[PDB]
């Protein structure tokens, strides 16, 4: 009858050839590996909600919006009294590196930098304004402009 237990030793060998210790080993190598991927290299950008005043006087530099690869940044537009200023339209410069979504009525545009380092510019035609507002958009910066108040120089339909 020695044949039965010899075969069965070979069996606990082959049908379950990764013994429980080796199964947990493979679990930990898999976990360490995907974590090693998921780690964003260097420090990640700091999530900062900033507020900037938009000046449309000639010679002024356009406002800067910092993005991050795969993250939503919400620009809200307010007039000099801080009230919402709805957006009439917008034009994406280089939509191949940025994607904007915006419900047609609100005054908030959310942006994701689709590729990591390419910077561009974005125009927004506003409700009561004759000169629109243009912003430079740079991703991969040491922070994310996580939600940005744009204090446009003019006065909106809400006072």
């Amino acid at each position: 009858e020695v044949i039965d237990k010899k075969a069965f030793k070979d069996m606990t060998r082959n049908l379950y050839p990764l013994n429980p210790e080796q199964v947990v080993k493979l679990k930990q190598i898999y976990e360490t590996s995907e974590y090693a991927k998921a780690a964003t290299p260097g420090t990640p950008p700091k999530p900062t909600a900033t507020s900037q005043f938009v000046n449309l006087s000639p010679g002024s530099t356009p406002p800067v919006i910092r993005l991050s690869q795969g993250f939503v940044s919400s620009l809200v537009f307010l007039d000099s009294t801080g009230a919402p200023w709805p957006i009439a339209a917008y034009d994406l410069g280089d939509p191949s590196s940025f994607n904007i979504q915006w419900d047609k009525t609100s005054n908030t545009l959310m942006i994701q930098a689709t590729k990591l380092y390419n910077y561009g510019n974005l125009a927004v035609r506003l409700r009561g304004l004759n000169t629109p507002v243009m912003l430079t958009l740079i991703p991969g910066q040491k922070a994310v402009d996580y939600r940005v108040d744009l204090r446009v120089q003019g006065y909106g339909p809400n006072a």
């Binding site: 050839p17 990764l18 493979l26």
Partner: protein
């Protein structure tokens, strides 16, 4: 000396499918009440 390579093959085929059972994530469901 062949035992090492044959057994490496057996549990490489094992480890691949263990990893595949690990990679799956089955999405939750929403049942909405009358």
């Amino acid at each position: 000396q062949q035992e090492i390579q044959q057994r490496t093959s057996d549990m490489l085929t094992a480890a691949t499918q263990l990893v595949q059972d690990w990679k799956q994530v089955e999405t939750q469901v929403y049942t909405e009440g009358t």
